[PDB]
C-alpha cells in the first residue's frame, strides 16, 4: 500500500469518467438539474435575442397542454400554447410569403408555398429552437421534446413576441432566424419535385415561348462507365440552359432543373438577401 | 498532433452574424468556498467583478453556488448544448476576469 | 496497475489533542524562568544526542563514545564498521576540497 | 519506503493518450510509445514549415495549369501581373482559377497585354510613349 | 448582542453631556485624556450607554476628546456576506445561494 | 569622405564622455532594493475568508 490520498481520488474521478462514458445516463431535462431558476432564465431568454417580452405572455408561450394533462394526472396521487400557436403560425406564414414574394417575384405560388412549408417544417424549426434555449424552457410531459411540441412552442414564442412588440419587430425576428436558414441551400434541396421537364415545359408555355429542344452539346467517354453528357436546352437556336450528367436522361433532367432555377431567380449567382 | 485529434470545419451556430448577433453563452456556475485559500481570488471576483460583468451582458445567467468546495469552478453552458467546465483554482482576480471574458466572448 | 481502487479510510486528526494543544510549552523556560533550566534540558530522546546535532559520522562517534560500553555486541561491531566507513568516506571521497 | 511515488499511473497515461492510434506495441507499452510520440511531436513541429512550402507549391501548380489552359505560362502570368501593379497572391489566383474562371481569363488577358506592351517597349529603344497598361501609379 | 452599529444623530449633545458630567471650558475638542481614570470613566459610560466599546487596539489612538468623537460616528455594521450581496441590488441574472 | 583626417578629432568626444558617465552611473548604482511592510502583510492576506 502506497500511502496517500490524492492519487486514489484522481483515479476515482477517472473511473467515474469511464463509467459515465461506458453506460451513459438517459438524458434528463435541464430543469431537473442543479443551477436552474425559471424566471431569471426567461428574462435572460428575452434579453438574449435583443428584444422585450411581456413576461406573463412568454410564460404562457412556454406551457404545453400535455404538461397540464400530465400534472393533473400526477395531481390525483395554467394557459396552454394554443391561441398563441395559431397566431404565431398564421403571422409566420403570411410574413414568410411576403418576404419570399418581395425579393423573388417571378416564382409561382406553389413554389413559394413549398418554401414557406419547408421553413416552418419540423426539421428547420427543431434545428433553430434547440439552439435558442427553447427546448430548455419548454414545459412538456416527456424528454426529449417531440418535434411537434417543440415547433408549437417556437411559434408560440413568435406569437408572444407579436403581441408584445408588434409586427415589425416580429418580421425582423423571422427575417433573422428563419430566412437565414436558406443560405447556402439550393432550390430543389428545399422544394422537392418530380419530373422537372414537364414543369419547365408548362412554365415555358406560360410565357408564350416555344418548346425547348434537348441537345447534346458535350460528352466524354460515351461507352465507358464514367461519361459526361452536357445536355443543353435550346429555344429558337438560343439556349435557355445547359446541364451535366452521368447519362443523357439525368443530364436532361439537370438541364431542366437549371432552366427552372434560372427562370425563377434561384441561380447560384443571385443577389444575396439584404439584412 | 492533428491526426491524433478530431477536426472540424469552421462554422457558426445558427448563422450567427447575418440577421443579428446572439450571445452564445447561457450560464456560468462558480462554486466559491467561504473558507479556503484556493478560491480566495474567486471570492474577490464575486466581491468585485461579477456584478459589472453581468450588467455588461444581461443574456447570461450567473450562479454563485457558495458550497464548501475545495477547487472552485466556472461552468459555461452554451446555446448548442456544449458545457465547458474550467478550474479557477489558485488564480488571481485578473486571470479569473480574463477567463470569464474568454468564456463570454467565444462560441 | 500500481494504484488503489478505493479511497483509503479517512485520517481523523484531532488538532486539539493532548499533545497538540500543549505543544511548545516550556520552550521559553530559560528566558522567563530565571534561567534555572535550559530548553535543551526539555528534549527527550537518546542520551548521546540530547541537545546536540551532527552529521552521521559525528553522531556515530558520539554514540560510541557515550554508550558503547553497554551496546550489544553485533550492534557495537556494526557501529565500529560504520564509523570506519564514514571516516574513510568523509575524508577521501567528495567533490569539494 | 518513506515516500515512494503514488501518482505514476497518470504520467504514463499522459504520454499514452497521444499514442492510442499507433500500430503494434507502440500504442500500449510506455517505453516504445515515449520514443514514437517524441518523434511524432518533432514531426508536427517541422511539418508546419513543410505545410507552408507544399501549399505554395500546390498553388503554383494550379496557376500553371490554368494559365497553360489559357495559352500562357505561369512565369509570364506572375511577372506581367506584377508589372500592372496587380498584387494578388498565389492563393487568391489559384482559388480564382478554380471557382471563377472568367475573372482568371480577364487576368490572363491583362497579363498578356502587359507582356506585349513590354515587348513593344524594349524593342524600339529610346524615348517612346509608354503603353496604356504600362503606367505605374506612384505612392508618396 | 451584535457589532451592528449606527451612529445616532444626537451623538454630539449626548457626548457634551457626558464630558460635562465626568468633569468644562470652551474648545472642548482639545481636552487631554492623558489621565487614565478620566478616560476610563468616559469610555465606560459611553460603552454602557451606546453599547459599543473601544477595542484594545484602538485604545491608545484616542488621546483627545475629538478622537473619541471621530471614533463613535463611523457606522460599524455586520452581517454574513450572503446578506451583503443579496441586499446589494443584484441585477436579475445573479442568483447567489448559501449552502451553509 | 566628407572631411579630412584632422577635422574628426574631438567633434563627438563629448557624447562618448557623457555616454560613459551614464553607463558608469548605471554600474555604480546597483544595490539591494527597498523592503516594505506592505508585501509581508500582503502575504498575511492568504487566509482571508468570508463572514
Ligand atoms: Mg517562400
Which chains sit next to A, with 3 or more Cβ pairs under 8 A?
A: B, C, D, E
Residue B36 near residue B61 (C-beta atoms within 8 A): no
- The burial class, CB within 10 Å (0-12 / 13-18 / 19+), for C45 is exposed
Q: How far apart are CA B29 and CA B73, in angstroms?
A: 7
- Asked if the C-beta of B61 comes within 8 angstroms of chain A's C-beta atoms, the answer is yes
- Chains A and D: 3 or more CB pairs within 8 Å of each other: yes
Residue D53 C-alpha to ligand 1 middle, in angstroms?
7
Q: How far is CA A184 from CA A100, A122, A208, in A?
A: 16, 19, 33
Report whether B42 contacts B91 (CB < 8 A).
yes
Domain extent, residue B78, equals: 1-107
Say whether both A179 and A102 belong to one domain.
yes
| Residues A89 and A170 reside in one and the same domain | yes
Residue-wise DSSP of chain A: ----SHHHHHHHHHHHHHHHHHSPPP---GGGSSS--HHHHHHHHHHHTT----HHHHHHHTB-HHHHHHHHHHHT----SHHHHHHHHHHHHHHHHHHHHHH-TTS-HHHHHHHHHHHTSHHHHHHHHTTTTHHHH-B-SSSSPPHHHHHHHHHHHHHHHHHHHHHHHHHHHHHHHTGGGGTT--STTTS--S-HHHHHHHHHHHTT-PPPEEEEEE-S-TTSSS--EEEEEEETTEEEEEEEESSHHHHHHHHHHHHHHHHHT--TTSPPPP-
Beta-strand pair A213-218/A229-235: antiparallel
Asked if residue B100 lies in contact with residue B84, where contact means CB atoms within 8 angstroms, the answer is no
CB atoms within 10 A of CB A11: 20
Q: How many domains are there within chain B?
A: 1
Backbone angles phi and psi of B27, in degrees to 5: -130, 175
Length of chain A: 275
C30 to B76, C20, C21, C22: CA distances (angstroms): 61, 22, 21, 18
C1: distance to nearest CA of chain D, Å?
8
Identify whether A257 is part of a domain: yes
Q: Rounded CA gap, A167 and A172, in Å?
A: 9
By C-alpha distance, the chain D residue nearest A5 is D6
User: Which residues 6+ apart lie within 8 Å of E23 measured at CB?
Assistant: E38
Question: H-helix or E-strand containing E40?
Answer: helix E36-50
Residue A233 has phi, psi (to 5 degrees) of -110, 115
Contacts of C1 in chain A (CB under 8 A): none
Q: Sort strands B27-30 and A238-245 into parallel, antiparallel or unpaired.
A: unpaired
Query: Is residue B87 within a helix (H) or strand (E), and if so which, with residue range?
Result: strand B83-87
φ and ψ of E64, to 5 deg: -110, 175
Place of cell 395559431: A86
CA distance A180 to A275: 10
Q: Write down how long chain C is.
A: 97
Q: Where are the domains of chain D?
A: 1-140
The residue of B51, B69, B72 whose CB has the most chain E CBs within 10 angstroms, and thus the best one to mutate to test that interface, is B51
Of A127, A159, A194, the residue at which a domain comes to its end is: A194
| Contacting residues for A103 by C-beta, under 8 A, at least 6 apart | A271, A273
- Decide if C94 touches A, using CB distance below 8 A: no
Query: What is the phi/psi pair of residue A139, to 5°?
Result: -100, 100
Which of A40, A45, A47 to mutate to test binding with chain E, by most E CBs within 10 Å of its CB?
A40
A6 occurs within a structural domain: no
Domain end call among A144, A162, A194: A194
The Cα–Cα gap between A159 and A145 comes to: 20
Q: Which three cell numbers stand for residue A114?
A: 413549398
Distance CA A44, CA B61 (A): 7
SS (H, E, C) A77-138: CCCCCHHHHHHHHHHHHHHHHHHHHHHCCCCCHHHHHHHHHHHCCHHHHHHHHCCCCHHHHC
Asked if residue A207 belongs to a domain, the reply is yes
- Using CA atoms of A79, A83, A85, A88 in order, give the dihedral in degrees to the nearest 10: -130
Burial A41-59 (b: 16+ CB within 10 A, else e): bbbbbbbbbeeebeeebbb
A2 CB within 8 Å of a chain D CB: yes
Distance of CA B78 to the CA centre of its chain: 10
The CB density around residue A219, as the number of other CB atoms within 10 Å, is: 13
Domain identity same for A162 and A213: no
Q: Which three cell numbers stand for residue A194?
A: 418530380
In terms of C-beta density within 10 A (0-12 exposed, 13-18 middle, 19 or more buried), how is residue D139 classed? exposed
How many whole angstroms from its chain centre is CA C86? 18
A151 and A263, same domain (yes or no): no
Shared domain for A118 and A175, answered yes or no, is yes
Nine cell digits for residue F15 = 557624447
**Nominal resolution (angstroms):** 3.5
Q: How far apart are CA E92 and CA A43, in angstroms?
A: 8
Query: E residues 40-99 near A, CB within 8 Å?
Result: 92-93, 95
Which of E83, E88, E99 to probe the B interface (max B CBs under 10 A)? E99
Say if residue A144 is preceded by a cis peptide, omega within 30 of 0. yes
CA triple A180-A183-A188, angle to 5 deg = 120
Q: Which residue has the cell 517597349?
A: D121
- Rg, C-alpha atoms of chain C: 21
Chain B residue closest in CA terms to F47: B37
Nearest CA in chain B to D17: B4
For the sheet containing A213-218, what is the strand order?
Answer: A213-218, A229-235, A238-245
Distance CA D115, CA D109 (A): 10
Closest residue in D to A9 (Cα–Cα) = D7
Do residues A55 and A46 touch, judged by C-beta distance below 8 A? yes
Q: Are B91 and B41 in contact (CB under 8 A)?
A: yes
Looking at the DSSP bridge assignments, the partners of residue E64 are: E32
| CA distances for B19 relative to A43, A128, B16, B65, E27, angstroms | 22, 14, 8, 36, 73
Distance CA A197, CA A257 (A): 8
- Cβ contacts (< 8 Å) between E93 and chain A: which residues? 40, 43-44
Distance CA B67, CA B71 (A): 10
Please choose, from the candidates B58, E92, B79, the residue with its C-alpha nearest in 3D space to the C-alpha of residue A37: E92
H helix and E strand count, chain B: 3, 4
Question: d(Cα A273, Cα A178) in Å, to the nearest integer?
Answer: 12
Residues pairing with A213 in the sheet: A234
Which element (helix H / strand E) includes B76? strand B73-77
DSSP F34: P
- Cβ E82–B54 below 8 Å, yes or no? no
- Indicate the DSSP class of residue D131: P
CB B64 within 8 A of CB E97: yes
Of D106, D102, D98, D100, the closest CA to residue D61 belongs to D98
User: What is the rounded distance in angstroms from the CA atom of residue D23 to the CA atom of residue D20?
Assistant: 9
Question: E55 CA to chain F: closest CA distance, Å?
Answer: 20
Cα end-to-end distance, chain A, whole Å: 68
**Phi and psi for E83 in degrees, rounded to 5?**
-75, -20
Asked whether the CA dihedral A20, A23, A29, A31 is positive or negative, the reply is negative
Are B57 and B63 in contact by the 8 Å Cβ rule? The answer is: no
Q: Do A114 and A70 lie in a common domain?
A: yes
- Residue D122 vs residues A112, D5, D119, D130: alpha-carbon distances, Å: 62, 80, 5, 11
Name chain C contacts of A5, Cβ cutoff 8 Å: 7-8, 11
3-class SS of residue B56: helix
Distance CA C90, CA E39 (A): 69
Q: CB under 8 Å to E94, separation ≥6 — which residues? A: B50, B51, B54, B62, B64, E85
Exposed (0-12), middle (13-18) or buried (19+): which is D123, by Cβ within 10 Å?
A: exposed
Kindly state the DSSP code that residue E36 receives in the 8-state scheme: H
Task: Please state the separation of Cα C61 from the chain's center in Å.
Answer: 14
Residue A140's φ and ψ, nearest 5 degrees, are -130, -170
State how far the Cα of A117 lies from the Cα of A187, in Å rounded to an integer: 13
CA dihedral C73, C78, C82, C83 (to 10 degrees): 10
Q: Are residues A114 and A202 in the same domain?
A: no
DSSP for residue B78: B
β-strands B61-64, E94-96 pairing: parallel
Q: How many domains does chain A have?
A: 2
Give SS3 for B77: strand
Q: Which helix (H) or strand (E) holds B97?
A: helix B93-105
Element (H, E) at B73: strand B73-77
List CB contacts of D28: < 8 A, sequence separation 6 or more: D16
Torsion of CA C76, C78, C79, C81, to 10 degrees: 120
Q: Provide the grid cell at D91.
A: 492563393
Residues of chain B contacting E93 with CB distance shorter than 8 Å: 54, 58, 60-62
* Of the candidates A34, A33, A32, A31, the residue with the CA atom closest to the CA atom of residue A42: A31
CB atoms within 10 A of CB C76: 15
> Beta-carbon neighbour count of residue F28 at 10 Å?
8
Residue D70, number of CB atoms within 10 A of its CB? 17
Instruction: Give the C-alpha separation, D101 to D66, whole Å.
Output: 9
Half-sphere exposure of E57 (CA within 13 A, CB side): 0
With contact defined as 3+ CB pairs under 8 Å, the chains touching C are: A, D
* Distance between Cα D89 and ligand 1 center (Å): 12
Which residue is listed with cell 504514463?
Answer: D12
User: Virtual CA dihedral for C22, C23, C28, C34, nearest 10 degrees?
Assistant: 40
Q: What is the DSSP string of chain C?
A: --S-SSPPPP----TT-HHHHTTTTTSSTTTTTTTSS-GGGS--S-GGGTT----HHHHHHHHHHHHGGGS-HHHHHHHHHHHHHHHHHHTT--S--
Contact A5 C5 (CB under 8 A): no
Checking A169-173 for CB contacts under 8 A at 24+ apart, the result is A169/A51, A170/A91, A170/A95, A171/A95, A171/A99, A172/B19, A173/A49, A173/A51
For residues A151 and A57, state if they share a domain: yes
Alpha-carbon distance of E94 to A49, in angstroms, equals 19
Domain span holding position A114: 31-194
The string over F29-46, giving b where at least 16 C-beta atoms fall within 10 Å of a residue's C-beta and e elsewhere, is eeeeeeeeeeeeeeeeee
Whether the CB-CB separation of A102 and A271 falls below 8 Å is answered with no
B75: three-class secondary structure by DSSP: strand
Locate A30 and state its grid cell: 435541464
Neighbours of F13 (CB within 10 A): 9
HSE toward the beta carbon, residue C72, CA cutoff 13 A: 3
Distance CA B19, CA A179 (A): 9
Amino acid at each position: 500500500v502506497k500511502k496517500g490520498f490524492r492519487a486514489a481520488f484522481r483515479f476515482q474521478k477517472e473511473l467515474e469518467r469511464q463509467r459515465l462514458l461506458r453506460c451513459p445516463p438517459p438524458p434528463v431535462r435541464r430543469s431537473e438539474k442543479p443551477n436552474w431558476d425559471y424566471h431569471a432564465e426567461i428574462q435572460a431568454f428575452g434579453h438574449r435575442l435583443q428584444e422585450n417580452f411581456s413576461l406573463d405572455l412568454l410564460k404562457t408561450a412556454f406551457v404545453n397542454s400535455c404538461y397540464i394533462k400530465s400534472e393533473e394526472a400526477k395531481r390525483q396521487q395554467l394557459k396552454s400554447n394554443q391561441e398563441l400557436s395559431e397566431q404565431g403560425t398564421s403571422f409566420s406564414q403570411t410574413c414568410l410569403t411576403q418576404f419570399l414574394e418581395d425579393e423573388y417575384p417571378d416564382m409561382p405560388t406553389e413554389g413559394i408555398k413549398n418554401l414557406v412549408d419547408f421553413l416552418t417544417g419540423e426539421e428547420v424549426v427543431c434545428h433553430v429552437a434547440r439552439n435558442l434555449a427553447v427546448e430548455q424552457l419548454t414545459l412538456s410531459e416527456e424528454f426529449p421534446v417531440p418535434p411537434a411540441v417543440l415547433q408549437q412552442t417556437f411559434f408560440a414564442v413568435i406569437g408572444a413576441l407579436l403581441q408584445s412588440s408588434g409586427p415589425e419587430r416580429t418580421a425582423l425576428f423571422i427575417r433573422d432566424f428563419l430566412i437565414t436558414q436558406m443560405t447556402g441551400k439550393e432550390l430543389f434541396e428545399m422544394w422537392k419535385i418530380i419530373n422537372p421537364m414537364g414543369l419547365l415545359v408548362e412554365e415555358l408555355k406560360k410565357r408564350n415561348v416555344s418548346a425547348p429542344e434537348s441537345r447534346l452539346t458535350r460528352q466524354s467517354g460515351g461507352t465507358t462507365a464514367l461519361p459526361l453528357y452536357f445536355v443543353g436546352l435550346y429555344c429558337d437556336k438560343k439556349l435557355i440552359a445547359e446541364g451535366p450528367g452521368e447519362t443523357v436522361l439525368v443530364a436532361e433532367e439537370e438541364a431542366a432543373r437549371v432552366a427552372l432555377r434560372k427562370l425563377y431567380g434561384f441561380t447560384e449567382n443571385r443577389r444575396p438577401w439584404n439584412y | 498532433t492533428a491526426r491524433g485529434t478530431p477536426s472540424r470545419f469552421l462554422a457558426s451556430v445558427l448563422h450567427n452574424g447575418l440577421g443579428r448577433y446572439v450571445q452564445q453563452l447561457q450560464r456560468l456556475s462558480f462554486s466559491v468556498s467561504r473558507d479556503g485559500a484556493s478560491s480566495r481570488g474567486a471570492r474577490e471576483f464575486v466581491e468585485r467583478e461579477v456584478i459589472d460583468f453581468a450588467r455588461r451582458n444581461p443574456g447570461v445567467v450567473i450562479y454563485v453556488n457558495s458550497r464548501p468546495c475545495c477547487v472552485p469552478r466556472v461552468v459555461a453552458e452554451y446555446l448548442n448544448g456544449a458545457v465547458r467546465e474550467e478550474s479557477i483554482h489558485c488564480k488571481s482576480v485578473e486571470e479569473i476576469s480574463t477567463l470569464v471574458q474568454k468564456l463570454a466572448d467565444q462560441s | 496497475i500500481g494504484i488503489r481502487l478505493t479511497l483509503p479510510p479517512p485520517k481523523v486528526v484531532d488538532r486539539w489533542n493532548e499533545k497538540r494543544a500543549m505543544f511548545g510549552v516550556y520552550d521559553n523556560i530559560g528566558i522567563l524562568g530565571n534561567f534555572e533550566k535550559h530548553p535543551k534540558e526539555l528534549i527527550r530522546g537518546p542520551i548521546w544526542l540530547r541537545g546536540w546535532k551532527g552529521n552521521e559520522l559525528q553522531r556515530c562517534i558520539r554514540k560510541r563514545k557515550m554508550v558503547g560500553s553497554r551496546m550489544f555486541a553485533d550492534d557495537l561491531h556494526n557501529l565500529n564498521k560504520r564509523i570506519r566507513y564514514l571516516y574513510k568516506h568523509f575524508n577521501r571521497h567528495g567533490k569539494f576540497r | 519506503l518513506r515516500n515512494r511515488v503514488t501518482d505514476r499511473y497518470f504520467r504514463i497515461q499522459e504520454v499514452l493518450k497521444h499514442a492510442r492510434h499507433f500500430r503494434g506495441r507502440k500504442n500500449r507499452c510506455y517505453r516504445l510509445a515515449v520514443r514514437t510520440v517524441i518523434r511524432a511531436f518533432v514531426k508536427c513541429t517541422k511539418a508546419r514549415y513543410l505545410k507552408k512550402k507544399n501549399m505554395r507549391t500546390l498553388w503554383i501548380n494550379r496557376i500553371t495549369a490554368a494559365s497553360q489552359e489559357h495559352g500562357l505560362k505561369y512565369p509570364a502570368l506572375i511577372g506581367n501581373l506584377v508589372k500592372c501593379q496587380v498584387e494578388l497572391n498565389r492563393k487568391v489566383l489559384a482559388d480564382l482559377a478554380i471557382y471563377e474562371p472568367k475573372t482568371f481569363k480577364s487576368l490572363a488577358a491583362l497579363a498578356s497585354r502587359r507582356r506585349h506592351e513590354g515587348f513593344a517597349a524594349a524593342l524600339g529603344d529610346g524615348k517612346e510613349p509608354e503603353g496604356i497598361f504600362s503606367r505605374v501609379v506612384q505612392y508618396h | 448582542r451584535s457589532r451592528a452599529y449606527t451612529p445616532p444623530e444626537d451623538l454630539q449633545s449626548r457626548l457634551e453631556s457626558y464630558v460635562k458630567e465626568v468633569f468644562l471650558p470652551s474648545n472642548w475638542q482639545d481636552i487631554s485624556l492623558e489621565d487614565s481614570r478620566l478616560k476610563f470613566n468616559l469610555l465606560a459610560h459611553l460603552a454602557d450607554d451606546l453599547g459599543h466599546v473601544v477595542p484594545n487596539s484602538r485604545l491608545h489612538q484616542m488621546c483627545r476628546v475629538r478622537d473619541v468623537l471621530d471614533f463613535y460616528n463611523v457606522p460599524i455594521q455586520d452581517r454574513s456576506k450572503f446578506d451583503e450581496l443579496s441586499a446589494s441590488n443584484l441585477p436579475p441574472n445573479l442568483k447567489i445561494t448559501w449552502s451553509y | 569622405p566628407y572631411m579630412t583626417r584632422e577635422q574628426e578629432r574631438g567633434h563627438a568626444a563629448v557624447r562618448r564622455r557623457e555616454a560613459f558617465e551614464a553607463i558608469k552611473a548605471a554600474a555604480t548604482s546597483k544595490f539591494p532594493p527597498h523592503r516594505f511592510i506592505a508585501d509581508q502583510l500582503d502575504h498575511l492576506n492568504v487566509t482571508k475568508k468570508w463572514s
